Amino acid sequence: PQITLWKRPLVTIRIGGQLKEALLDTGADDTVLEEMNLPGKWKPKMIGGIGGFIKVRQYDQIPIEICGHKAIGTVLVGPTPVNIIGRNLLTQIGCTLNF
Amino acid sequence: PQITLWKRPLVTIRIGGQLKEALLDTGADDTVLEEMNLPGKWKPKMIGGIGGFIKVRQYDQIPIEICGHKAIGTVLVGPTPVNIIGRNLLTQIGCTLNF
Ligand SMILES: CCC(CC)CN(C[C@@H](O)[C@H](Cc1ccccc1)NC(=O)O[C@H]1CO[C@H]2OCC[C@H]21)S(=O)(=O)c1ccc(N)cc1
């Protein structure tokens, strides 16, 4: 599909039994999801943006479905105000910028 | 162009005769540039990112050429970690997401 940018590029994602709305975010290196108690091993990380840093948990090889497209990879989890699909998964679903 | 996302979508912009590198950021509502001088009136504003809120200077109707495409719109100047082109100007240059 083609998503214009007149509004925030929010799409439906699924991670296990949770459907969520998330931004398709070319400015994010890695996917960051709102706090959720995912199973499995993780490592602490701090990620930085406007306003400073937040602490997140890095989970690897997590399957996520994004608008019906399958992805699997690193998912950061922490107190972000918005769910963010970053470049690590945008490439897996075939997403490009075009102008 | 078509821009894939295996690397950061950094592009050269021209603003006030100056060449800068900026990140095409679909998860940003607004265009935010690192500290720089711009002419004319500005308004104090605050904006929030992943790590909290910052103070910025809001300049309206500023021309920026983004990868050869002309925009004229609002530019916020302040302590962003990197220069970002947000949706306010991505829409003007006809940028969409495609997958
Ligand atoms: C270092 C480059 C940017 C910050 C500049 C990185 N951000 C993604 C960005 O798209 C963010 C994503 C974002 C969206 C909404 C809330 C927080 C973050 N947007 C953002 O800060 O936009 C601000 C400018 O316009 C405004 O509209 C949205 C917030 C304002 S981020 O959220 O801080 C971020 C950093 C690291 C990872 N892995 C994932 C995300």
Listed by start position, the domains of chain B span 1-99
Match 């720089």 to its residue by tokens: B36
User: Measured in angstroms, how far is the CA atom of residue B79 from the centroid of ligand 1?
Assistant: 13
Please give all residues whose beta carbon lies within 6 A of any atom in ligand 1, as ranges.
Answer: A 25, 27-30, 32, 47, 49-50, 76, 81-82, 84, 86; B 23, 25, 27-30, 32, 47-50, 80-82, 84, 86
A3, A32, A54 ranked by CB distance to B96: nearest: A3
Measured on CA atoms in the order A88, A90, A94, A98, is the torsion positive or negative?
negative
Max CA separation in chain B (angstroms): 41
Rounded distance between C-alpha atoms, residue A4 and residue B69, angstroms: 17
Phi-psi region of B89 (alpha: psi -120 to 50; beta: other; left: phi over 0): alpha
Beta-strand (E) ranges in chain A? 2-3, 10-15, 18-24, 31-33, 43-49, 52-66, 69-77, 83-85, 96-98
User: Measured in angstroms, how far is the CA atom of residue B60 from the centroid of ligand 1?
Assistant: 21
The token pair at A26 is: 């070319």
Phi first, then psi, for residue B65 (nearest 5°) are -100, 120
CB atoms within 10 A of CB A83: 20
Rounded distance between C-alpha atoms, residue A53 and residue B66, angstroms: 28
- Catalytic: B25? yes
The token pair at A95 is: 């997403």
Rounded distance between C-alpha atoms, residue B13 and residue B92, angstroms: 14
Helix or strand or coil: residue B87? helix
Helix or strand or coil: residue B88? helix
* Closest residue, chain A, to B46 (C-alpha): A51
Residues from chain B that touch A6, judged by Cβ atoms under 8 A, are 87, 91
CATH for A1-99 is 2.40.70.10
Residues 6+ away with beta carbon under 8 Å from A87: A26, A28, A29, A30, B5, B6, B8
B54, B67, B99 ranked by CB distance to A95: nearest: B99
Number of A–B residue contacts, CB under 8 Å: 135
Match 């107190």 to its residue by tokens: A79
Match 């102008």 to its residue by tokens: A99
The count of C-alpha atoms lying within 13 angstroms of the C-alpha of A62, restricted to the half-sphere facing its C-beta, is 27
* Closest residue, chain A, to B22 (C-alpha): A27
The token pair at A55 is: 């602490």
Which of B70, B38, B98, B14 is closest to A4 using CA atoms? B98
Cα separations in angstroms, A42 against A18, A96, B92 = 19, 29, 41
Rounded distance between C-alpha atoms, residue A23 and residue A8, angstroms: 7
**By what technique were these coordinates determined?**
X-ray
Which residues share a beta bridge with A8?
Answer: none
